[PDB]
Design a protein around this ligand. Structure first.
Ligand SMILES: CCCCCCSC[C@H](NC(=O)CC[C@H]([NH3+])C(=O)O)C(=O)NCC(=O)O
Ligand SMILES: CCCCCCSC[C@H](NC(=O)CC[C@H]([NH3+])C(=O)O)C(=O)NCC(=O)O
Lengths: 221, 219
């Protein structure tokens, strides 16, 4: 009946992984872009935001806030969350590691300049020594095209999204991880993901200084 | 019995202790006491991302707080009846997590920042989080946050109410429905037993325990 409506500002931020997941699922959606603090205050005043924050997604008659609530619902609805409780446990473990690394990268620009260089270095070492080894190992354990259940899940989508951001950081980091490289390609070639990667999709560019400034004005930080 | 791998402290394992206890599930704990203990877990292949919490349950070695909790909640029927009830539960408990994270990390803030960050936490409790949960309870008038049945949401929220009480017992005072929930949940036989002295419930982290954390986790 009604397309999901995504409420956020015009940036990756905390809404991009939802854009990826919906697109991967073949689900069309609309976006309503917040451009100012007054836009956000209006959502607040209208009663639309349980904790007075965005992301918020209107879907199936609900007003869902909190990134993980949104993604868990969409993943379940479009059978991207595994086939039983144990596969969901594997998915969750994998994607919370992805979330942890993703949060580090997300927040980097918001670091004090005297700290940013150490923090980036630390992110690169965790990538090389902690996270990419863990995911490579999963893929090597079973030899399958997907992380869990030998079928596409949200885990594959969330990890490939992150591989795109790590490439932006440093395209060398993935070089010693052939299986991750192969996953990136395979997933990128799925027709829904290929369309999402093409120009003109809702996929968002890296956040530049001006966008970061808009964020500070809109969310008041 | 599930086996919980963590240090002898609340930290990131306490919400799992609460949820297991609430569900009536007996568990065992293996306490890490040194960096060397953590290193053995890592070396033995027990930790996917070289971190704890880790829980051995039903043949899996599960890391990541949320993976552990989601598995336990589904297994013991504390995650609602369908994906829409799960959506409500998830939205509520991620709000709880956000607030919980601020309180958890308070002892680690630089000392020159701690005064400001406590005051911010009290402000958000008063003006953002407790209003939101009081609003949910008032909206339906039922004893439980979701589905008129006990769920993980009630348990995680009441755990947080105890920590907020530790911070400032006045913060809940204008929120009568949250007070009632706290009482009700605390009186359920499993939660009551967990709240009594000598249970696996952990105390507030003191300075000695925070020094142990730092040695163990090398920060
Ligand atoms: C470099 C900057 C990156 C910008 C990302 C910030 S997202 C906007 C922020 N929303 C949250 O922090 C939501 C956190 C919540 N845990 C979620 O995951 O949905 C907001 O509404 N803030 C308003 C408020 O909290 O009052
Ligand atoms: C106020 C004190 C806070 C208590 C310490 C934090 S918990 C121990 C820490 N584990 C994590 O940070 C796990 C985060 C993960 N997202 C989860 O929720 O499980 C660890 O293993 N760290 C070792 C490392 O990462 O190498």
């Amino acid at each position: 009946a009604e397309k999901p409506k995504l409420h956020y500002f015009n940036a990756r931020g905390r809404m991009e992984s939802t854009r990826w997941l919906l697109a991967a699922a073949g689900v069309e959606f609309e976006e309503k872009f917040i451009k100012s603090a007054e836009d956000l205050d209006k959502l607040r005043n209208d009663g639309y935001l349980m904790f007075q924050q965005v992301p918020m997604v209107e879907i199936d008659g609900m007003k869902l806030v909190q990134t993980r609530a949104i993604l868990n619902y969409i993943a379940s609805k479009y059978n991207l969350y595994g086939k039983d409780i144990k596969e969901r446990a594997l998915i969750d473990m994998y994607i919370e590691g992805i979330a942890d690394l993703g949060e580090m990268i997300l927040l980097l620009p918001v670091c004090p300049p005297e700290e940013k260089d150490a923090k980036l270095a630390l992110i690169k070492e965790k990538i090389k020594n902690r996270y990419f080894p863990a995911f490579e190992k999963v893929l090597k354990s079973h030899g399958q095209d997907y992380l869990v259940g030998n079928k596409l899940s949200r885990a594959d989508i969330h990890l490939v999204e992150l591989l795109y951001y790590v490439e932006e950081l440093d395209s060398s980091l993935i070089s010693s991880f052939p299986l991750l490289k192969a996953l990136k390609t395979r997933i990128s070639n799925l027709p829904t993901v290929k369309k999402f990667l093409q120009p003109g999709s809702p996929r968002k560019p890296p956040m530049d200084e001006k966008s970061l400034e808009e964020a500070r004005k809109i969310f008041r930080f």
